[PDB]
Amino acid sequence: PPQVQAMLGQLDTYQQQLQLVIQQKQKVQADLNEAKKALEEIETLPDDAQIYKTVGTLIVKTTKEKAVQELKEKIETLEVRLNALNRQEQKINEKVKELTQKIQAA
Amino acid sequence: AMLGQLDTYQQQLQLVIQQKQKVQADLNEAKKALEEIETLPDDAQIYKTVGTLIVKTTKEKAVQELKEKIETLEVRLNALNRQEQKINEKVKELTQKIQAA
Amino acid sequence: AMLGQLDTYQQQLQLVIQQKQKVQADLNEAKKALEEIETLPDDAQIYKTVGTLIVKTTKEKAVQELKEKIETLEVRLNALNRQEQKINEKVKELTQKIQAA
Amino acid sequence: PPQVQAMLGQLDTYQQQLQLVIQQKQKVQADLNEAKKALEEIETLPDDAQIYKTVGTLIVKTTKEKAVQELKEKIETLEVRLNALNRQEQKINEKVKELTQKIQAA
Amino acid sequence: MAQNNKELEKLAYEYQVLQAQAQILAQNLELLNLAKAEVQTVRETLENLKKIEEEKPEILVPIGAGSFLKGVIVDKNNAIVSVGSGYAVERSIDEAISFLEKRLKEYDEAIKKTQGALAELEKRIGEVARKAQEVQQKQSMTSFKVKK
Amino acid sequence: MAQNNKELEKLAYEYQVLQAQAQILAQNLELLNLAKAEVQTVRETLENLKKIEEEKPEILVPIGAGSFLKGVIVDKNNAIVSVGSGYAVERSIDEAISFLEKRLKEYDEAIKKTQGALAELEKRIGEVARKAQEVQQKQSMTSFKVKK
Structure with a gap:
């Protein structure tokens, strides 16, 4: 399915970017x-x-x-860097639920 | 054996990426x-x-x-940088000459 | 579970043999x-x-x-020595009480 | 076979004693x-x-x-200890060939 | 019969999964009791240093492969102990030993945690090889029968 | 057909045997280049020590977990280097560096040996996966046939 095969290619990105952030987010946590x-x-x-x-x-x-x-x-600076990574993850988080409902609608 | 040259240029590209990390961080x-x-x-x-x-x-x-x-550290950084886009030009060359053939 | 006591007394006998070696050598x-x-x-x-x-x-x-x-080192040597023939008396006891039953 | 099952039980010893000697013999060699x-x-x-x-x-x-x-x-003292382990192995060596021919003769 | 073999395989499959998630716990427990053993030795060296009467003690400082340099310890009364995060504070021998014993107790508790999770995992394997050894028993009886 | 599969299995079996006897060679080669890297660093520290102008240099001697003591190196001109077998000799910095470079060359040659046996083993695998890939090729042709 062309229209949805592209929809999944983007979410393959979103879910992967979410990984880099949480990994960096754990680092910052332990650093703190x-x-x-x-x-x-x-x-x-x-x-x-x-x-x-x-x-x-x-x-x-x-x-x-x-x-x-x-x-x-x-x-x-470490706590602020931690709030940045919370926003950073919340935006990819919602952008994923939006790609999830937009695939199910197709 | 044009693949015996791509497997080669691929391990090359790797140890350079590896050294570039240790270098860009050590720097x-x-x-x-x-x-x-x-x-x-x-x-x-x-x-x-x-x-x-x-x-x-x-x-x-x-x-x-x-x-x-x-x-000196910055010097080697540029070294690995050129060596990277060069081994990549060689990789993109064999991937095109092998993919066309 | 008389075998849950022989598996036990067997690991005991082991770490003692292990310490007896490090002790008899360190001594x-x-x-x-x-x-x-x-x-x-x-x-x-x-x-x-x-x-x-x-x-x-x-x-x-x-x-x-x-x-x-x-x-002090020699003291512990005798310690492990008694503990050995004791855990062995317990091992030879269960191997006989289990082998008879 | 009773007569030979005992013959093999002794050689199971000989061949095993030969191992302890060569192992100790390598140690002495490297020590030297x-x-x-x-x-x-x-x-x-x-x-x-x-x-x-x-x-x-x-x-x-x-x-x-x-x-x-x-x-x-x-x-x-290390070289002499090495000659001792040569004799030590030669005696178990021949005692094995003697147990090998004495089993084949049975 | 194939529905009874999928339940007896689900227990023998969770065995290698719960015994693998317990292979990591044995790994981390080997690290902790080692770091703690190192701390105990850095404390051991300090308590002994407190005992060496000598003014400014002569030492051999190890620099690598069988190599040593000749030196002397100038402040036998104090020690720089790492406070963490890129910092270390100079303390009296006692203050230092005391701080080390406090980190030695931090390890002492991390060991317990990892030793207790490794405990319940040896419990979930004992009760899984027990639920499955009983599923294999009732399987060889539904088959078995006294003959003729 | 079962006599041709036992010869094609003998090559694919000697593959895991010759590639396992080459797993040990990669292990010992990881030890050598490490010991050599340590020797190079003990030499590195010596050559730099020769360069520090200071009379009797002040140092921090590492005693364990983030712990250091305050000292000074009293004979910056000499070093005790291990001669082996329970003995170590004091040398001038130069004599020491020189002896280290001689042991650094002993490692340099042990690496070659192990790197050359690891070479011929990658040769015996290349020619075995080549003899067997050819035995598999002539096996799919004795079977194959253009249809009707």
């Missing part, structure tokens, strides 16, 4: 977990506590003050 | 690292990872070495 | 080590392996710790 | 290789060269002099 637990661990430290950050290949000695700023930012 | 990572380290005081306590050793280095030497890593 | 090794180190001058340069660290120690402390390792 | 290559490596050193030996869990700083004595001994 790791960031949060790290933050609450640093908060328990004296301001004078000596903390070490990893900058890619390197390791720089930063401070509780700086560390807690960076960590608070990371978390929030 | 984007180095870029961020230099980006961040440049914002540091000169007396910053930094440890550089020399293979198996984690030795202390300086802000200056750390940014020096970091630029070279970026440079 | 025979320690024995040789102490044997050799005792023949050393007191100012001998020795490094002791503390978990992940390889720290320098003394002839005296090295032989001290080495005797304790031997002692 | 490792010991020899180590020795020839130490010989190239100045008498003052600082060498480190491993005593089970420990590491003791020994000397080229001592190291080369220990290594020379190890090799020889």
